[PDB]
Structure formats: structure tokens, C-alpha cells
């Protein structure tokens, strides 16, 4: 148990064996690179604490965390170069930057303010953010993805995602840029912000309280929407729309579907919310004229 006083940040080069999973703990910064050379790791830190910075390998893994306890360390920079990555775990108020990563499947686990950037083409099936962290991912091409959140993440994902289910009980904000799915089931419990856009064959939305679903620019052929007290949903149904508002909730549509069916229970309301000045606006038919 030693501190870092009296020592400044110095450059160190070290050699590491083969690893396929990285677990990093501590208030530090990680830079990732990808090449066809040997793997290596560079540990920029204080020479009193270069021994305390632990680079250990146990069964095709890499554990970069605190060694001999944590009396004090302020700044650690970990640059990494390898070939294959399959799991990434990050904890303890840090920064992660990586780009141009090619993979088949790997799992992110961010916890406790991991300010993270990925600027590659990562096909990931699972991802987890614990709480109070931002995440900006540019480029995801996966055939399956399941996201569940429990804390306060601020996460945005770009690419192509075949999402299947979504549950939120925390204070999360999530935005995906392009999706191409077949059946989505969205459940929002306490205070959620969801922003999707793409093509969905069948959509089911459940909002309980203080939840906002902005499913505008997400064109759904079949939509089932249920809103309970003080929740807002903005949908873009195309072929068949079925909506229910229970009590002091608001449902808005933005497209005139071929079949519309809306229900109101106590104080909820479903509104048209179109432009009225668009030059190609469409009127109701014999088959769409429902009077609220």
C-alpha cells in the first residue's frame, strides 16, 4: 500500500500474452487499437505506482485493476493493441476510446461513469450500462440485440440493429439511429426516454407513468399501444393501429393508417397532430372515419 506522491507520469512499454477479454477497474483512461502485429500494452503512470498497476492474465483474460489496495493514484493511461476481443468490462469513473474494431460477438459492461467512444463496426448481441454514464457508439451491425437498463444511462447507438425486446425501469435515455426488426416489445416503467427510427413489422408499447416514447420516424405496419397515467407516446403506424389511453395520458400519431382503432378510458386522449398545410395531405375514407 503506497501512494503516488513525488512521482510524475512516465512512459512504460510492457509485453503481454494472448487475451480475449479485458476487465479494467479504476479512475483511468483506455485507448484501444487494432493491428496484425503482436499484442502489447503501454502503461503511462507514476513509477511509484507502475508496480501497483497490475497487468495479470488468467485463462485467456486480462485484469487491469488496482494492485496492493488503493491508497492513492490520480492519472493512469492504458494504450492497448491486440487482435481478438470478446468481452469488455469497465468500472470506476474512467474514459474509454476505441475505433476500427472488427468482431463477431462481444459484450460491453460499463459501470459508474465510463465515458466511452466506439467508432468501429462492432456486431454485439448484449450490452449493459449500470448507471450515471454516457455512451456514444457509431456503427453496430448485429442480427440480434437485447438491452435492459436499471440506472441512469445516456446512450446512443448508430448502425443496423435487429432489436427484439426493451425494458426500462430507471431514468435512462436511449436513442438508436437505424433499426430493421420484426417484432418489438417495449416496456417503460418509471421515467424513460426512447428514440427509435427504422422499419418494424409489429410493435407493442406499454407505458406506465412519466414515460415518453418518441416512435416518430419509426414506421410500424402493426401497432399496439397502451398508455397509463401521465405518459406520452408518439407513433407512426402504417397499416393497422390499435391504441388505448387510460387516464391523463396522451397518444399522438403522425400517419394516416389504413385501419385505425383508438380507445379512451378516464381522461386520456388520442389526437391527430398533423400539419394541416401539407400539399399532399390525405383525408379520411369510409374505412378510417372514427369519431372520438
Amino acid at each position: 500500500e503506497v501512494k503516488k506522491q513525488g512521482t510524475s507520469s512516465t512512459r512504460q512499454f510492457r509485453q503481454v500474452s494472448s487475451f480475449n477479454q479485458i476487465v479494467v477497474q479504476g479512475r483511468l483512461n483506455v485507448n484501444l487499437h487494432t493491428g496484425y502485429n503482436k499484442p502489447e500494452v503501454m502503461l503511462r503512470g507514476d513509477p511509484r505506482d507502475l508496480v501497483q498497476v497490475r497487468t495479470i492474465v488468467k485463462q485467456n483474460t486480462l485484469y487491469v485493476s488496482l494492485g496492493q489496495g488503493y491508497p492513492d493514484y490520480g492519472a493512469v493511461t492504458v494504450d492497448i493493441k491486440t487482435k481478438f476481443l470478446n468481452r469488455f468490462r469497465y468500472e470506476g469513473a474512467g474514459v474509454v476510446t476505441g475505433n476500427n474494431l472488427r468482431t463477431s460477438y462481444l459484450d460491453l459492461y460499463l459501470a459508474n461513469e465510463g465515458t466511452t467512444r466506439l467508432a468501429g463496426n462492432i456486431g454485439l448481441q448484449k450490452l449493459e450500462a449500470v448507471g450515471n454514464g454516457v455512451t456514444q457508439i457509431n456503427g453496430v451491425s448485429s442480427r440480434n440485440l437485447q438491452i435492459v437498463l436499471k440506472g441512469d444511462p445516456k446512450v446512443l447507438i448508430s448502425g443496423f440493429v435487429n432489436l427484439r425486446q426493451l425494458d426500462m425501469y430507471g431514468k435512462g435515455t436511449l436513442s438508436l439511429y437505424w433499426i430493421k426488426s420484426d417484432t418489438l416489445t417495449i416496456r417503460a416503467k418509471k421515467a424513460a426516454k426512447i428514440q427509435l427510427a427504422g422499419i418494424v413489422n409489429r410493435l407493442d408499447v406499454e407505458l406506465w407513468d412519466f414515460a415518453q416514447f418518441k416512435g416518430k420516424y419509426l414506421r410500424a405496419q402493426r401497432s399496439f399501444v397502451k398508455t397509463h397515467d401521465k405518459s406520452v407516446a408518439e407513433i407512426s403506424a402504417v397499416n393497422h393501429q390499435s391504441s388505448l389511453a387510460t387516464d391523463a395520458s396522451d397518444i399522438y400519431y403522425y400517419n394516416l393508417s389504413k385501419t385505425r382503432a383508438d380507445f379512451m378510458a378516464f381522461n386520456g386522449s388520442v389526437l391527430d397532430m398533423r400539419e394541416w398545410g401539407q400539399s399532399d395531405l390525405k383525408d379520411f375514407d369510409r374505412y378510417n372515419k372514427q369519431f372520438p
Binding site: 389526437l271 391527430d272 397532430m273 394541416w276 372520438p292
Partner: protein, 93 residues
Amino acid sequence: YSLLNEIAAFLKQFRKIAITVTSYSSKYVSVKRERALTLARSRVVSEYLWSQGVDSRIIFTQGLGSDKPITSYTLGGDRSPNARVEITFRRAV
């Protein structure tokens, strides 16, 4: 619907050509929501009035939102006096 039946029974006593139904509300979230709400309210009211047997030729429906208030006291919601529906016509001959 009993009040709407009373209004329809009053309206059957005259001869007329055109009726106008206009809706006004108060400020809740924005202007688009209140204009859509007033248009939907006027549509439903005129739908029930046309379902009942008033002998008119044209019924016009509009919802103006909160553009034209009749009272400067704007503290209430739907309990405000300037949240209303208006039915105007002219007796013919």
C-alpha cells in the same frame, strides 16, 4: 347526451340552411394540440347533431384553439369561461 338531445330538440323548431360549430379551449401544451383538440370536439358534437334529425343543409365545423378569448380571467382549465363550444345560425324566412 341528454343535453345534446335538448339542444337538438331546440334546433328542430327553426328553418335554416347552414349551421356553424366553432370550438375554443385554453393553453395546455402547445398550439397544435389545442387546435387538434378543438377540431375533434367540434367534429364529435356535429356528428351527434347530424345523427339527430336537424333539417339543415350544411353544417360547418372549425376549432380555433385559444385565439379568441371572451374573458381576461384565464386562471382555470376547462372550468374557465373562455373554453366553450358555439353554435351559430340564421333563421330563414
